[PDB]
Amino acid sequence: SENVSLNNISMQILRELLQYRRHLTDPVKNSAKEEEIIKTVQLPRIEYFIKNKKPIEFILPAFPTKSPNINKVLGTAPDMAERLSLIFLNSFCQRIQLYYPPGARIIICSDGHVFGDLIHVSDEVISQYHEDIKQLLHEVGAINLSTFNLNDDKELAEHSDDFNLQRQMLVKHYARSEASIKDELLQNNNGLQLYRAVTRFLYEDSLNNALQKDAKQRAIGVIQRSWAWGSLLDTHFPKAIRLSIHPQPADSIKFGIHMMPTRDDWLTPWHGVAANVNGQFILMKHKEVQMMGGKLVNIHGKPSHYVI
Numbered sequence: 653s654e655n656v657s658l659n660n661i662s663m664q665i666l667r668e669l670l671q672y673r674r675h676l677t678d679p680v681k682n683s684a685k686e687e688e689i690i691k692t693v694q695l696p697r698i699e700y701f702i703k704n705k706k707p708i709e710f711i712l713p714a715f716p717t718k719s720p721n722i723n724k725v726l727g728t729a730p731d732m733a734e735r736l737s738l739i740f741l742n743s744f745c746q747r748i749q750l751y752y753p754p755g756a757r758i759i760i761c762s763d764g765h766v767f768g769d770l771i772h773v774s775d776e777v778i779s780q781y782h783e784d785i786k787q788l789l790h791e792v793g794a795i796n797l798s799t800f801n802l803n804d805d806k807e808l809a810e811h812s813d814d815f816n817l818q819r820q821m822l823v824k825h826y827a828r829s830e831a832s833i834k835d836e837l838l839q840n841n842n843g844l845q846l847y848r849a850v851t852r853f854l855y856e857d858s859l860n861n862a863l864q865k866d867a868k869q870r871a872i873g874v875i876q877r878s879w880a881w882g883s884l885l886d887t888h889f890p891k892a893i894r895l896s897i898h899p900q901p902a903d904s905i906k907f908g909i910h911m912m913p914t915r916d917d918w919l920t921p922w923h924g925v926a927a928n929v930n931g932q933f934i935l936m937k938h939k940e941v942q943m944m945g946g947k948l949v950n951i952h953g954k955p956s957h958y959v960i
């Protein structure tokens with residue numbers, strides 16, 4: 653029968669994923685139950701790829717652009733924190749080859765032009781971040797990793813000239829009402845914790861109650877836009893395992909993933925800087941490292957990381 657063998661393969665890929673799971677840390681939660689739920693969730697989607705002897709396909713939306721706050725991050729360009737995370741992702745795909753020869757691939761999807769106005773970053777800066785991240789993949793030989801653009805969608809008419817044109821088309825065909833959004837965020841403690849995180853980060857990027865009010869409204873907007881980019885991808889790559897840089901419920905189709913060691917569930921490399929602390933690279937915010945006795949290190953002139 654050998655379905656035990658097929659289960660043995662897919663369970664190794666799941667067990668590796670689990671070692672890197674990004675979730676809402678709560679001691680009331682019995683993580684054991686969470687996995688048992690996750691196993692039921694993702695194992696079948698994995699097995700679609702093994703059964704057809706194809707590579708395991710992962711879809712991740714991430715690296716949209718670097719945060720504007722100099723206080724939060726060190727530069728506009730992708731620093732060492734991006735590089736290490738990119739390097740980890742591609743290596744994640746190779747260890748799968750040791751179990752499973754077809755291997756695994758991740759189509760990283762650029763989130764930048766989607767919400768670029770709501771986050772207060774120029775469409776031009778976002779574009780440069782994007783070319784750079786592709787270059788970082790070539791510099792580093794991250795073969796298993798791919799990029800998926802906003803331009804890649806056939807329906808947008810290649811509006812390089814007007815991203816706003818691309819923006820309106822995505823909202824029409826793929827967005828839900830912000831009214832329908834606030835409702836959905838508020839039903840579950842997961843939805844509530846997404847809402848706060850998105851509002852906090854937007855407030856942090858600004859750098860007061862009125863500013864907090866702006867973040868609360870901008871949050872529902874940035875959520876709506878990022879969930880549109882989700883449905884665009886939801887149709888394009890349906891059978892692909894879903895990776896997120898956000899914490900996820902154990903019942904979600906999305907699987908939350910960490911790409912660096914970090915004390916924050918929501919911190920991602922475009923909201924931080926890479927710090928070498930006790931011979932371990934850590935993701936921490938550029939201010940918090942400055943109060944730390946942190947010596948900046950720079951590579952190719954542009955600063956890459958802070959060493960402690």
Ligand SMILES: [C-]#[N+][C@@H](Cc1ccc(O)cc1)C(=O)O
Pocket residue numbers: 716717718719720763771850853854857874878920922923
């Ligand atoms: C999804 N998503 C992003 C949203 C974002 C990105 C960049 C930025 O400067 C501000 C907010 C995240 O939560 O990291």
